[PDB]
Amino acid sequence: CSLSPEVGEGPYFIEEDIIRSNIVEDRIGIRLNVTLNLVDFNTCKPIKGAKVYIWQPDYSGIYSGFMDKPRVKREKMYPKDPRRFLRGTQVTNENGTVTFETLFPGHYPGRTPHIHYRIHANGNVAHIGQIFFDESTSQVIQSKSPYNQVRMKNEEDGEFTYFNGKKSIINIDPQSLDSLEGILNLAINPLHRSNLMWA
């Protein structure tokens, strides 16, 4: 129960209700279950009814909707393809929990591997961030197929450094090396209006 850090949205958010737990579609990689537990910063009690969005690139660093890897611009970015793999939304339960069935993310050049997330509560964009991986685990996974077929360090990454990525690393249960299980506990502020959206 300390306020989780926020991190810039980047350019590839797509504001669509795709409410599902399994976001893999046709993508290939290593299965990762991402469980996020949300509490209200103020009370430390779980937050119920919050919409959690995640989005991430596939193993070779492609984002669905931006598969033609277009030029990035400060002005509002619009997806060209209709694919939505590796994107989803889940609504927190009584316990403040959502779980997604995803893959370990690939990454871009000039970025460390991560999964984005954005949370709506009370019709406000309450919190935007990024999920990072412990260096040892990331190294293990990147040595396996298909991740090893195409890496900026956490500490080289502008976003990780500037926005406290250290407090935003997902905890992977090591014995889960059938499918990986990851837990990240977050404390957010449902009254906060984030200003970290791309537009």
Ligand SMILES: [Fe+3]
């Ligand atoms: Fe990204």
